[PDB]
Nucleic acid binder design. Sequence first.
DNA 1: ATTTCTTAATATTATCCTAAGCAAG
DNA 2: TTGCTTAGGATAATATTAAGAAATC
Lengths: 219, 219
Amino acid sequence: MKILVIEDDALLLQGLILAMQSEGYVCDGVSTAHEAALSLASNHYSLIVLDLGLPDEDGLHFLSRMRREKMTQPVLILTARDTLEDRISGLDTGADDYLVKPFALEELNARIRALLRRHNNQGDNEISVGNLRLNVTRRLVWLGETALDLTPKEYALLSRLMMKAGSPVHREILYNDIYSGDNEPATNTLEVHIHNLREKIGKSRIRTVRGFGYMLANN
Amino acid sequence: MKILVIEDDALLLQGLILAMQSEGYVCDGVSTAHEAALSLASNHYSLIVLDLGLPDEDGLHFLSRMRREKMTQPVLILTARDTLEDRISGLDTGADDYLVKPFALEELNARIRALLRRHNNQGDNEISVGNLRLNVTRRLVWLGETALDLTPKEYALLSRLMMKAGSPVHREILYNDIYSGDNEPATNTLEVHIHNLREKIGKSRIRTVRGFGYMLANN
DNA sequence: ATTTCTTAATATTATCCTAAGCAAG
DNA sequence: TTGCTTAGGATAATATTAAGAAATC
Ligand code: BEF
Ligand code: BEF
Ligand SMILES: [Mg+2]
Ligand SMILES: [Mg+2]
């Protein structure tokens, strides 16, 4: 992953860079606020380590400037400004950690590791067949570029279907999926729900298997 | 929003709680790991402060297990174990931050603010949906060019709504953001608050999603 | 001293079931 | 024959009010 490091003392800068190389990340150092602005413009960084005492611009003004611009990457301020009063200012500015100089390098590597652990990991679970996009995580359904309201049961069927997509699910499975198991209606409930589901999602991407169960079209 | 605090020293434990409450979060404190274990199952916590020295089992064992079970909540270790070897170990288990005792409360509050800002928001200090502007750190909300006086609970909702905006937020979560487990109302308080909230921000920026919860509209 | 929160009785709607008269496999 | 289709009426689910307890100021 690409780490930008921002340090005005170039002696340290080469140190931080070497550490980042060594820990296994891809790294860029820059010695000033302006140069960093540039690197960020062109490159895609997974993180930013930033000193506050930069010659051209104050690090926080730089930080505040970035988030205004909707630059969202994790930032670890690594600075020599050690006041409780400062740390708060750094963290409220939108930094994701604050590490004071002097510092144990191995602390830094690990703090660095912790921010990255979450970054790569935002994976929210979707399984989709054709132009229907479904969020098992966010609960929202898309035909093309518009969205769909599915009722608790309507959603619950089309859910079970896209998990099993391509294969017929026995109808009694869906009756037990739409019910707590002790609640089974005399009339055809499942049949109505599939009709509705079909009617919105473009009937039919669910193609019916007579005498057994139901299934939906993917390939 | 709800914070779980885990502390064996009850003097501090009662202390942290008031601190957390005062910041606008609703809070649960517990004195042991096992109590913590059971609480996590029942309630939805937005962050966990976790002490290490604990009577039943060491926090790290609890943390490792949470992580093993794919518990995604941000955890801030606040411990008295300060050697650098310890600090690295916690983060590597891992915590999203590690803070040694004694500590400035105001550092803790700001670090916590930072983790939640990163978890729920893009890392952004403010959130905008439509003409709604919210400042997460100031606890302040702007509808259009005008300000909104929202009660503590009205705010805690509209906040959770805007973070998740576009995605229906499940009812059990909104409710869990507003109550400490000791205050859990028998009646339908959430339904009213949303009504009250609605009357302020207007009908209808909140679209109710039946059988699930409430959700907020952007596009 | 006044806001904010709850309680609980009543109106109200999405979603659901029901049944009847129909279309396919 | 089995499964699809429709709507008017049943049912949970959520809204509304209001005022009575709690919390803040
Ligand atoms: F110049 Be940095 F804050 F050490
Ligand atoms: F027991 Be904890 F580490 F303060
Ligand atoms: Mg410097
Ligand atoms: Mg302890």
